[PDB]
Amino acid sequence: TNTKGKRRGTRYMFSRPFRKHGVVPLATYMRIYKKGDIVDIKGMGTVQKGMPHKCYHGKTGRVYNVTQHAVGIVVNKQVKGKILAKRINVRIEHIKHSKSRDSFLKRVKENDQKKKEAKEKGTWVQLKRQPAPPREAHFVRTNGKEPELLEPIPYEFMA
Amino acid sequence: FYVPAEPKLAFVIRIRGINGVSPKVRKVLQLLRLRQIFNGTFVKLNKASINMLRIVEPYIAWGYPNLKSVNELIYKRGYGKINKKRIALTDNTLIARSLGKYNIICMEDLIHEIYTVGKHFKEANNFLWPFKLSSPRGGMKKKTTHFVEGGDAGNREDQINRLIRRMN
Amino acid sequence: MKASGTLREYKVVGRCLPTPKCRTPPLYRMRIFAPNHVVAKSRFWYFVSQLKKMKKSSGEIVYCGQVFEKSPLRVKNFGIWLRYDSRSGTHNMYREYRDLTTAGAVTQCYRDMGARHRARAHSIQIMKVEEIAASKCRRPAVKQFHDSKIKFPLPHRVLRRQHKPRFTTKRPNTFF
RNA sequence: CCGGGUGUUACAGCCCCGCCCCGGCAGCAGCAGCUCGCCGAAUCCCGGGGCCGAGGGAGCGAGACCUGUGUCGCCGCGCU
RNA sequence: CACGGCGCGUCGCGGCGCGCGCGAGCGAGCGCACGGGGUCGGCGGCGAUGUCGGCUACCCACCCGACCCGUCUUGAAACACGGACCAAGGAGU
RNA sequence: UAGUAGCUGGUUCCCUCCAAAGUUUCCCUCAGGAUAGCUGGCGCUCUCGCCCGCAGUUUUAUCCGGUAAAGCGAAUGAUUAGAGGUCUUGGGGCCGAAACGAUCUCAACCUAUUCUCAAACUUUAAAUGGGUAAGAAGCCCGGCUCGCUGGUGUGGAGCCGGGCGUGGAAUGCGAGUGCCUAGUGGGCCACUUUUGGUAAGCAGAACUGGCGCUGCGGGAUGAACCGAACGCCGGGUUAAGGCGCCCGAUGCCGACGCUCAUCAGACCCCAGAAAAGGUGUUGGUUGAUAUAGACAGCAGGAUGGUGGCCAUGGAAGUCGGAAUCCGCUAAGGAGUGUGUAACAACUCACCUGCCGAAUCAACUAGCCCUGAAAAUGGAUGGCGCUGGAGCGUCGGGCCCAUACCCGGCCGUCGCUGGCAGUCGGCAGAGCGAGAAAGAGAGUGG
RNA sequence: CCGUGGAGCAGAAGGGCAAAAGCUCGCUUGAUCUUGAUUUUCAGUACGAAUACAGACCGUGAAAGCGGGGCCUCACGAUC
RNA sequence: GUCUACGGCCAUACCACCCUGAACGCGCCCGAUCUCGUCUGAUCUCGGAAGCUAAGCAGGGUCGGGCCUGGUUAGUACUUGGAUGGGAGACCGCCUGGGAAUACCGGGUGCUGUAGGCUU
Ligand SMILES: [Mg+2]
Ligand SMILES: [Mg+2]
Ligand SMILES: [Mg+2]
Ligand SMILES: [Mg+2]
Ligand SMILES: [Mg+2]
Ligand SMILES: [Mg+2]
Ligand SMILES: [Mg+2]
Ligand SMILES: [Mg+2]
Ligand SMILES: [Mg+2]
Ligand SMILES: [Mg+2]
Ligand SMILES: [Mg+2]
Ligand SMILES: [Mg+2]
Ligand SMILES: [Mg+2]
Ligand SMILES: [Mg+2]
Ligand SMILES: [Mg+2]
Ligand SMILES: [Mg+2]
Ligand SMILES: [Mg+2]
Ligand SMILES: [Mg+2]
Ligand SMILES: [Mg+2]
Ligand SMILES: [Mg+2]
Ligand SMILES: [Mg+2]
Ligand SMILES: [Mg+2]
Ligand SMILES: [Mg+2]
Ligand SMILES: [Mg+2]
Ligand SMILES: [Mg+2]
Ligand SMILES: [Mg+2]
Ligand SMILES: [Mg+2]
Ligand SMILES: [Mg+2]
Ligand SMILES: [Mg+2]
Ligand SMILES: [Mg+2]
Ligand SMILES: [Mg+2]
Asked: How far is CA C160 from the centre of its chain?
């Protein structure tokens, strides 16, 4: 059977990208994580302290505790037929703010603003994101040039 | 050239049985409310509906229904879902109560709203119980393969009307 | 394709959707022989995807209509340039037929391909169909019908409707 | 009569091409009941064959000045 | 033409729309029916020692179907095991 | 002493409803247990007749990866071949006392190239896929507490109070929660992916669906294939598959072709065949030559230097080694073959006479044939079939499943549906009707 | 002088590392005392291993800081 | 236009060679009493201001290497789902969707934050 080591099969997952080894850029250290941010997990092999287990690599969780160097986050893990929301502590290098939430936040601010506006105007405005509707009817103008014929080319071997 | 607008309404008929269905296809068929062979329903078209139908192409025959097809389907096979019960629509008051708040008050409102995909098409279609169509008189071409390659599955633009004429 | 019944000829023109790169993509036109317009559009998308970097999701059928025969009362000779797949390798050929309609000639071509080379419609790729003058015809099976005083009998007429008089006291005659 | 050759309207015809009101006239997806289509808010009428008939007190009008009846509700009509 | 009274008519844009009163939101009868699931206010024969009815059940014929049960087993008609037949007794207290 | 048995065998009435597992971890554990998982029963808390949630699904955003592919003129590791440079060294020689002084070279070396590779290589890098978000538990304000952090009522957190409902993607659907609990813990098969193995109806995995637990139509037969899942019936129509007879349906004046087998062929799984060949036949590709008269076929020529040089005992063209010339010519090869030891002789290439319009190849692909040998007599299911009842492409019509549609009947579940209003000379017969609520009781003008 | 690691970091291999995690010196004993939480196998139980903290005593450095064993992935043991 | 101090993103910023640098600045540079450290005041530390853009550094150049970004390769390779498709097989074709990577050919060669100067 296999081995139950903590880092089995991570030679590519925890490795560094090509031509990106060396000193960790300081912007990663200079970011602020508060209680309740949605955050992504991406193990970085450069630092070995507080490295998350390989099964949380690429997972997104919620911050619930902030500490000197690390952050505690609640993340869902599918174990057999059930999902457990378990909390793990990850050092700040292996973490990154999720941009999936800021889009929704900006949308909230923007449609709240356009709801506050036009409230006095009384006009109607659409807020829900409708799915891509079918294309409407239109005209395709030929400019006096007729469409050119397309025919299959004859078979002839290359190799 | 004048390209007509892409159709907004489609009719879908399940043409495969219950035995041996992939879980994803089973879930999409449940969502589309095709739990029985030769069941049919109306679907409004968008990106989500296109992809959902593409997932279950081998199990359904779908097309763009005609006005006469909508009329006949509503009048002959049309039953309403009132109080979680399948009630045949034999009077306008049954429609008027279930869809009065949406200004649908009779068969004509129901048919118009379905055919033109109105603002409350979702409510109208959900009130409409899935259609139980008889087996296609005259037979099918080939159930297993796609319509383009001479079968019956997949998308047939307007031949769904020919299919409906014999399946109802 | 399933070569069901007699084929029909369709003129199909299509184009890419307008994009910020280019406002008006060029329109591409093709002749498709197909049982109906649905399979005609499918074949158009297939061929244009092979030729150009076009897909149905990133394109649109600007127009699709059946083209009727110009002279359906004049018997004509048709030359067809064709590309097909064998069990081992693919081949280009040229075959001539004799018929009143281009669609009829192409249907004859499909049936002849199936009969002589066991090639199927999904293997045949039809390339060119042209009216060919009797002087330019070069297959003897078509050339032998090019004469003013054509004359031949019907030598051995086989009795059909063999079952309507299922028990008949004659032995049937085959010389008429 | 046939065969071979020449050739360009002749004692047959064929194809294309500017116009003559797209020349004019029917007609028209034609019961010249098969030359090739897709259909019906742009669709109605009549007829034939087969199987079945489950359910069983729906009410009407009469007005506390009457007490009848069992063809009644919705719908479409007709007559006064 | 699912049009139909008189008015005060601005309830009004120029009349149509569209409001306020008119014992004040009460006209009645008959009749036909593509109308909340069939009725006939339609008929015809054969009936006393040779005839009527009797699904099933007794015997027989025909067409179609049809391998012997129980058990262990992935798999039993098995060239796997128990079983000639019948009566009584016989095992989650 | 009815000793123990994780092991065999057996384990007694009906109907109704629900309905599995052969998988995880531990065990002197591997024919067994415990524990999760899968099941049933009992409930309970709410819900609708504005809104909550949920989803084996999609959409819009946003991250995650190192497989398929590809690459070696990129790293690592393999790997073929020639080019150009030098003394940076070695090896055969050479002139040199010697001299990087010099001549070739063979090499190793360097620089550009070049052929082919990787499960334990990789700059790149999919498709399918794995998370997260898509609002009321949200946004926007005002104010308090803090022993934490603090240049700073700084930061952060917790508290109160107040204002905002277009309930902020599609589709579908009532949801949550708690006890007790049986059986199971031998599995097998199939498309796709995949490891060992020459391979196997072998052994081992991943995903999904099946069989087991399951009947029905078709595949003649059949645990798994194709269709379709089932209460008892009538009518209609189909799926897959079929329609010469067995055997329901083509007893159509069905369409176009191909094929002759002295071993024909005849329908997923599937039950039998390859390389190589055919001047059998049918298509197709490419290249030639033919009225300056071909292809046949019938006839005439097919010469000198020279019996060319090296050769062998003998080679005159015909065993051997290079070349292959000229004048004569309508043409003749220092020769295509047969022949002798050598000749000789015959014959061919090539050109002429007659004949007078099409003729040669080389490939390629269909059907058929050779390749093709096993034992009881023998199996497209059989009979049989060749203007097919075979093969390929196709058209109408027709046949039938327990599937689908309509109807009847039985039962189960749901509506936690309705009925105490049988309110009668003491009475007045309703609460089906699109619109939350009185056929309300009475007092004045 | 060139030298992106082609060396070294105890060991297998893989990942990681250049004014360092390598080499050489200086000083030391965070390999110390203590309660909880979490991850890894998982039944989501132990052991083992590991991760963030918190409370004392310290080490080092000018200091920010770093350190409660070894750069990470393995080197170990219930009841009585 | 540009520099210095501290930086963010970390080659469009690197590497090789060549040309030009006004002012400030950054440097090279001059010494070892003190602080400090070496075999050596070379480095480090300290005290200065005679000279110089030689070098670093900055800007620019190269049919430059590299790097970054496009086209081609290419709807090719591969691939989700489907068939009672073909083939003895190996494998291949089609339907429904997604869709690469070399060679080869183009374009570009650091943006920018805070504080403080020079261009009087
Ligand atoms: Mg199936
Ligand atoms: Mg029929
Ligand atoms: Mg299938
Ligand atoms: Mg029988
Ligand atoms: Mg047994
Ligand atoms: Mg079993
Ligand atoms: Mg025995
Ligand atoms: Mg036994
Ligand atoms: Mg016995
Ligand atoms: Mg007994
Ligand atoms: Mg006992
Ligand atoms: Mg045992
Ligand atoms: Mg046993
Ligand atoms: Mg891997
Ligand atoms: Mg590969
Ligand atoms: Mg196996
Ligand atoms: Mg089951
Ligand atoms: Mg089954
Ligand atoms: Mg069989
Ligand atoms: Mg039936
Ligand atoms: Mg049969
Ligand atoms: Mg029914
Ligand atoms: Mg250091
Ligand atoms: Mg501490
Ligand atoms: Mg160390
Ligand atoms: Mg000095
Ligand atoms: Mg300088
Ligand atoms: Mg200079
Ligand atoms: Mg360059
Ligand atoms: Mg700056
Ligand atoms: Mg000046």
From this structure: 30
